[PDB]
C-alpha cells in the first residue's frame, strides 16, 4: 500500500532527535565530574530535562511511525488520511522542538510565568517538565493520530496485532492525562505520577512494543499469523497481570500503606515473565524460520531487543524491585543503571527494529539493503548494544558503592551525599567513555541510510 | 491450548487486577489524612511545593528518594541542617549563597527568590519529612 | 552539633616526638578534610596539612613534610598529629579544624570548626 | 606560597562606630578570601568565605568584599563581643595560608 509512505518522516524525525539525546546525555556524565561545566549557561537540570524530554518525544515518534507503516498493511487498505498524518507530524515536530527551545533559553521559573502555569499548576514534575500548553498539545496530536491510525482500523481487516497495537495506543494517551492531575498532597502527586510512567512503560507500552515486535516476526518469518498472535496474547497477559498490582514496587517509600510492600514485592517479582517470554517468541519463531530474509540485520534486531530488554527490565528490574532490598537502592545509581537498560532494550531498540525493516522498503529501495550497508547496521548495532551494558555495569558498580558507603552505615559513620559522589568519580569518568562509544555506534547506524 | 483461550486470559486478567488495583487505590486514599498530616499542610507548604516546582529542584534533587541523582535527598534535609528550630533561618541562607563557585564542584542555581517564597520553601520540605513513609531513608544523610 | 575535642597540653625533650589527638562528634566524620595549624605566640597561624578520613589520604605543607605525620582512626572519629624530633620552636598551640565542606576535592578551602588547641611545650 | 598581610594591626574603636579592616595578597587569590574571629575561651569562629559570603549565623552587620589582591572586612556597628581577633585565610591555592591578625581594641 502506497499512505505507508508517511512513516518515514516520523523515523527519520525519531533518529534526529534521538542524536540529540545522546549529546545531552554526554553533557550531563562530563557534569557529574566536572561540575560546574557549562554552569550557568546550561545548568544539570536543564540539561537533563532535554535529556529526557528528547527521549520520551523520540519514542513517541517511533511510534507513530511504526503504527502508520504498519496499520495499513494490516487493516488491509490505505490509511485513513495521508494529508492529515503530514499536518499531524509538523504539528507535533514543532511543539517538540518549541519546547525544548523553552527549557534552554529561558530560566525555568520564567518559562512557568511566561505559560501561565499558575492558572494550571503541571510543570516541574519529572518527565512532566513541559509547559501545559504543551502537554495541551499533545493531548490534540495524539486525538488527531488516534482518529487517523484508529478509522483505517475500523473500515479494514482487524487482526490481534493492529488491535493490541491499538489498545497500548490508546491506553497511552488516556494514562497520559493524569500529567494534568496536579494534587496539593505530595504523597498523591507522587501516587498519580506513576500512573503516567510505570503504566506506560510496564504495561501500555508494552502492548505496543509486543505488537510491533509480533509484526515483524509475521513479516520475516513466515510463521502462522495464528501462532504468533496467540503468544501474543500470552504476553500481554502476563504483562498486566504482574505489572497492574507491580506499580506497588513504586510505593514502597512515598507514604502509602505498608500493604503496598508485600503488594508491589510479590506482584512485581513476576513482572520479568512477558519479557523472559518475548525472548522465547523471537528466538523460536525465527528458528523455526519457514523462509530467509535478504535483511538480516532486523533479525538481530528483534532477537537484540527481547533479550535487552530481558536483561534491562526484568533482571535489573527485579534486583530491586523487593522492598527489603529497594530500602536501601531507592533513588540511587542502581535506579539509573536499571532506567538506562530498559528504555533501551525494550524501547529504543524496537523502534530501530522496525525502522530496520520498514526503511529499505519505505525508500522504494527493496527488502534489504546492500551488503556494505547491511554490515554498518550490524556494527552501529553491536557498539550501542555493548556500549550501554557497559553504562550500566559502570552505574551499577556506582550504585553499589553509594549504597556501601551512604546508605548501610549509622548515623556517624554513614558518608554525606557529596563526599559518596566523589568516591563514586571513576566510574562516572568509565560511563562517560561508554556514552562516548556510544555515539560512535549510534552515528554508525545512521551511516547506514 | 488456542488463541481464543490466551485472549480470554488477557481479557479477565486485566479487568479483575483494573478493578482490584482500584478498590486499593480508593483504601490507600482513605488514609492518606494521616499518614502524611493533611492537617499540617498549610497554605505556606502549598505554596511550597508550587516553588519546588517553579524551579525544578526535581532535576537535580531526589524528594522521598524520587527525581534527579545529581544533588542530595531533601526530604530529611531538615535533620541534617539545623531541625526544626533554624531550618527556615539556614534555608534563607542556603539560597542567597548560591552558587558557591568551588572550582569543579557540583553547582547550585541562584533563584532570585524572595523571602516569603523561600519560607514556603522551607515549610513545604520541614512537613514532607513528617509523612509516615515506612521509615525511609535508612539514615539522616537520606 | 558539630565538635573537636583536643588532646591536653604535652611536654617533651628536645630531639624527642609527641602526639595528639583530635576527638570529633556531630557529623560525618569520614566526609570532610580535617586540617591542623600551628600557632606560636605573636606569629600568626601556618597550616601544616591534612588528612581525609574517608580514603586516609593526606596532605603536608612542605615546611612541615619532615616534621608532621597525620592519621585517622574512623570508628573512633579520631585525628592524629605527630610531631618529630622536636626542636624549640616547635613550642606553639596546635589546632585541629574541620573543612566547612564535604568531600575529597575541596582540599584547599576555609574551615567551619576549630578545636581549642594544644599546647607542645619544648624544653630540657 | 601565597603571603598576606593584614592592616592595620591593631584598631582602637568604640560601640556603634563602623571600622573596615584590610588584607592584601602577595599573588591573585581570585575571590577566594576567609575571615576567623578569635576570642580568648572561644573556638575560632568562621566569619566571611568567598569574599563576601556570610557564613550560616553570623550577624548581617558583619560584611567583606574585594578579588584578586585586596579584600576588606567591615563591621557596620560595632558591638561589645566584636572586639576580638581578626585573621584572613586565603582559600585558593595550595599550601592555605593565613594573615597574622588585626586585633580590634575597645578605645576608652
Known amino acids: 500500500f502506497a499512505s505507508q509512505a508517511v512513516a518515514k518522516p516520523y523515523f527519520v524525525f525519531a533518529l534526529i532527535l534521538f542524536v540529540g539525546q545522546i549529546l545531552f546525555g554526554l553533557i550531563m556524565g562530563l557534569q557529574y565530574v566536572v561540575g560546574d561545566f557549562l554552569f550557568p549557561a546550561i545548568p544539570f537540570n536543564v540539561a537533563r530535562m532535554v535529556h529526557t524530554n528528547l527521549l520520551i518525544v523520540w519514542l513517541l515518534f517511533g511510534f507513530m511511525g511504526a503504527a502508520y507503516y504498519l496499520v495499513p498493511e494490516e487493516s488491509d487498505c490505505e490509511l485513513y488520511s495521508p494529508k492529515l498524518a503530514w499536518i499531524l507530524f509538523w504539528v507535533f515536530a514543532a511543539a517538540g522542538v518549541l519546547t525544548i527551545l523553552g527549557y534552554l533559553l529561558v530560566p525555568y521559573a520564567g518559562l512557568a510565568r511566561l505559560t501561565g502555569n499558575e492558572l494550571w499548576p503541571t510543570m516541574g514534575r519529572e518527565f512532566l517538565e513541559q509547559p501545559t500548553i504543551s502537554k495541551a498539545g499533545i493531548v490534540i496530536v495524539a486525538l488527531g493520530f488516534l482518529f487517523n491510525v484508529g478509522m483505517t482500523v475500523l473500515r479494514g481487516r482487524k487482526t490481534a496485532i493492529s488491535m493490541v497495537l491499538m489498545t497500548g495506543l490508546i491506553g497511552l494517551a488516556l494514562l497520559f492525562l493524569f500529567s494534568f492531575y496536579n494534587p496539593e498532597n505530595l504523597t498523591r502527586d507522587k501516587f498519580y505520577w506513576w500512573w503516567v510512567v510505570h503504566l506506560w512503560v510496564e504495561g501500555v507500552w508494552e502492548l505496543i512494543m509486543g505488537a510491533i515486535l509480533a509484526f515483524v516476526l509475521v513479516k520475516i518469518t513466515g510463521v502462522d499469523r495464528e501462532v504468533i498472535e496467540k503468544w501474543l496474547y500470552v504476553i500481554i497477559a502476563m504483562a498486566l497481570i504482574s505489572g497492574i498490582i507491580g506499580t506497588g514496587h513504586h510505593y514502597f517509600w512515598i507514604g502509602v500503606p505498608g500493604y503496598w510492600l508485600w503488594l508491589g514485592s510479590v506482584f512485581s517479582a513476576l513482572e520479568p515473565l512477558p519479557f523472559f517470554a518475548m525472548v522465547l517468541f523471537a528466538f523460536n519463531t525465527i528458528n523455526r524460520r519457514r523462509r530467509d530474509y535478504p535483511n538480516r540485520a532486523v533479525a538481530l534486531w528483534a532477537m537484540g531487543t527481547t533479550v535487552m530488554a530481558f536483561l534491562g527490565a526484568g533482571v535489573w528490574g527485579f534486583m530491586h524491585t523487593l522492598a527489603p532490598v529497594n530500602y536501601y537502592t531507592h533513588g540511587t545509581q542502581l535506579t539509573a543503571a536499571h532506567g538506562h537498560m530498559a528504555f533501551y532494550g525494550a524501547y529504543a531498540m524496537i523502534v530501530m527494529t522496525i525502522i530496520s525493516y520498514a526503511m529499505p522498503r519505505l525508500r522504494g529501495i527493496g527488502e534489504a539493503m546492500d551488503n556494505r550497508s547491511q554490515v554498518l547496521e550490524m556494527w552501529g548495532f553491536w557498539l550501542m548494544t555493548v556500549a550501554m551494558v557497559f553504562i550500566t555495569l559502570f552505574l551499577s558498580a556506582a550504585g553499589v558503592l553509594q549504597v556501601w558507603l551512604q546508605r548501610m552505615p549509622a548515623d556517624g559513620a554513614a558518608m554525606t551525599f557529596m563526599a559518596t559522589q566523589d568516591q563514586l568519580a571513576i566510574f562516572y569518568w568509565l560511563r562517560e567513555g561508554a556514552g562516548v562509544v556510544f555515539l560512535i555506534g549510534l552515528v554508525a547506524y545512521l551511516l547506514s541510510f | 491450548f488456542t488463541k481464543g483461550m490466551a485472549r480470554n486470559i488477557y481479557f479477565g486478567g486485566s479487568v479483575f487486577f483494573i478493578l482490584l488495583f482500584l478498590a486499593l487505590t480508593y483504601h490507600t486514599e482513605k488514609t492518606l489524612p494521616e499518614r502524611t498530616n493533611e492537617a499540617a499542610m498549610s497554605a505556606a507548604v502549598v505554596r511550597g511545593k508550587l516553588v519546588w516546582e517553579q524551579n525544578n529542584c526535581v532535576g537535580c534533587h531526589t524528594l522521598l528518594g524520587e527525581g534527579a541523582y545529581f544533588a542530595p535527598e531533601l526530604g530529611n534535609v531538615v535533620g541534617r541542617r539545623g531541625g526544626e528550630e533554624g531550618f527556615n533561618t539556614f534555608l534563607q541562607a542556603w539560597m542567597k549563597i548560591q552558587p558557591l563557585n568551588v572550582p569543579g564542584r557540583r553547582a547550585m542555581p541562584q533563584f532570585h527568590l524572595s523571602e516569603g517564597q523561600v519560607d514556603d520553601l522551607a515549610e513545604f520540605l520541614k512537613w514532607s519529612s513528617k509523612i509516615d513513609t515506612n521509615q525511609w531513608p535508612p539514615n539522616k544523610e537520606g | 552539633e558539630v565538635q573537636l575535642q583536643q588532646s591536653g597540653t604535652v611536654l617533651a625533650r628536645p630531639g624527642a616526638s609527641v602526639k595528639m589527638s583530635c576527638k570529633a562528634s556531630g557529623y560525618s566524620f569520614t566526609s570532610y578534610w580535617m586540617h591542623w595549624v600551628k600557632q606560636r605566640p605573636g606569629q600568626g597561624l601556618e597550616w601544616i596539612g591534612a588528612?581525609?578520613?574517608?580514603?586516609?589520604?593526606?596532605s603536608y605543607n612542605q615546611k612541615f613534610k619532615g616534621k608532621a605525620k597525620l592519621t585517622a582512626v574512623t570508628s573512633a572519629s579520631t585525628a592524629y598529629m605527630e610531631l618529630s624530633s622536636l626542636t624549640n620552636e616547635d613550642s606553639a598551640v596546635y589546632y585541629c579544624?574541620?573543612?566547612?565542606?564535604?568531600?575529597?576535592?575541596?582540599?584547599?578551602?576555609?574551615?567551619?570548626?576549630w578545636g581549642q588547641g594544644t599546647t607542645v611545650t619544648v624544653s630540657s | 606560597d601565597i603571603q598576606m598581610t593584614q592592616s592595620p594591626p591593631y584598631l582602637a574603636a568604640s560601640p556603634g562606630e563602623t571600622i573596615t579592616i584590610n588584607c592584601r595578597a602577595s599573588?591573585?587569590?581570585?575571590?577566594?578570601l576567609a575571615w576567623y574571629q578569635e576570642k580568648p575561651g572561644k573556638t575560632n569562629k568562621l566569619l566571611i568565605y568567598?569574599?563576601?559570603t556570610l557564613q550560616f549565623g553570623i550577624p548581617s552587620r558583619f560584611s567583606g568584599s574585594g578579588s584578586g589582591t585586596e579584600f576588606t572586612l567591615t563591621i557596620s556597628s560595632l558591638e561589645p563581643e566584636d572586639f576580638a581577633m581578626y585573621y584572613c585565610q586565603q582559600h585558593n591555592e595550595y599550601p592555605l595560608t593565613f594573615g597574622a591578625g588585626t586585633k580590634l581594641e575597645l578605645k576608652r
Open positions: 579544624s574541620r573543612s566547612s565542606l564535604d568531600g575529597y576535592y575541596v582540599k584547599n578551602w576555609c574551615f567551619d570548626v
Open positions: 568567598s569574599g563576601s
Open positions: 599573588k591573585s587569590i581570585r575571590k577566594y
Open positions: 588528612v581525609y578520613p574517608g580514603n586516609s589520604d593526606t
